[PDB]
Amino acid sequence: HHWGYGKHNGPEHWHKDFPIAKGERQSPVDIDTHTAKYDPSLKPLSVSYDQATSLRILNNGHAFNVEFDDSQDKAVLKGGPLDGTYRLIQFHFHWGSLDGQGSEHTVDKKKYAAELHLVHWNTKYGDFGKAVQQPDGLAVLGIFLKVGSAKPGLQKVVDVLDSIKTKGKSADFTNFDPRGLLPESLDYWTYPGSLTTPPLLECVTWIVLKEPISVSSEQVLKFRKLNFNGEGEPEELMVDNWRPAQPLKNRQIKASFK
Ligand SMILES: CC[C@H](CNC(=O)c1ccc(S(N)(=O)=O)cc1)c1ccc2[nH]ccc2c1
Ligand SMILES: [Hg+2]
Ligand SMILES: [Zn+2]
């Protein structure tokens, strides 16, 4: 039936409706830090989120998305392995039912508690729909979340989760500054991949930050109270909305640091 993360409609079943699931540049992947090629030609990443305009938080049945006004170059990602300007359209997380899993990408087979995906699309393509039809249409900045001290910047998000507990619910969520979610360092690994949830389009230049951000146990706990189901249906806790690592195949993961 409709795709999900359960036994009967999960990642292992995706290839049936989305043949690209078994494609050449699927994400996420395991970042083998020792096979990763340090690349001194990679520029530093440039994250300009000062003019960021968040609009709302939406529980879409598979995660909760914080959407941003991407009608202008308000919050953009440039540099690094990117050619051109990528606009922030939304960010979401993938988390586990337990702290030892939840990330999509793994570093040396290590799973983090969650993974923040700041989704950007290449402005040369005009709109998000067009960019998803291009090899370099998307740039997702992935940030690992490890359980530790609270990330103050993530608290506004956590607080509004009560309002969007079920599928389909949305809440006004303005004046949220995504810079509060960035780790201290912007070093990254980059490789060409795809969306990690159907349609699994292979339009993503993945920029996975080396340094994770730490969030508190209480914070990730509130993620786990979200529901996959809509209001009125049997309750299915939104946890483990992550896709397992896919074969790297003919790809090289480059690193911006030694
Ligand atoms: C055209 C359908 C599209 C749906 N999908 C996504 O946006 C998406 C984004 C990132 C990732 S991941 N896990 O790889 O980081 C997976 C999926 C979609 C859906 C609703 C929309 N509203 C505005 C734009 C827009 C785009
Ligand atoms: Hg594509
Ligand atoms: Zn994601």
From Swiss-Prot:
It catalyses: hydrogencarbonate + H(+) = CO2 + H2O; urea = cyanamide + H2O. Keywords: Acetylation, Cell membrane, Cytoplasm, Disease variant, Lyase, Membrane, Metal-binding, Osteopetrosis, Phosphoprotein, Zinc. Changing A63S: 2-fold decrease in enzyme efficiency, as determined by kcat/KM ratio, and efficiently inhibited by chlorzolamide. One of its GO terms (cellular component) is cytosol. GO terms for biological process: angiotensin-activated signaling pathway; carbon dioxide transport; morphogenesis of an epithelium; neuron cellular homeostasis; positive regulation of cellular pH reduction; positive regulation of dipeptide transmembrane transport; positive regulation of synaptic transmission, GABAergic; regulation of chloride transport. Residues 1-257 form the Alpha-carbonic anhydrase domain. Changing H92Y: In OPTB3; partial loss of activity. Zinc. Can also use cobalt(II) with lower efficiency, but not copper(II), nickel(II) and manganese(II). Substrate binds at T196, T197. Changing P199A: Normal CO(2) hydrase activity, but impaired stability. The modification Phosphoserine is found at S163, S170. It is an enzyme of class 4 (lyase). One of its GO terms (molecular function) is zinc ion binding. Changing H62A: Reduced CO(2) hydrase activity, rescued by 4-methylimidazole (4-MI). Reduced proton transfer. Enhanced proton transfer. Enhanced proton transfer capacity. Changing N60L: Reduced activity. Interacts with SLC4A4. Interaction with SLC4A7 regulates SLC4A7 transporter activity. Interacts with SLC26A6 isoform 4 (via C-terminus cytoplasmic domain). Belongs to the alpha-carbonic anhydrase family. This is Carbonic anhydrase 2. The gene is CA2.
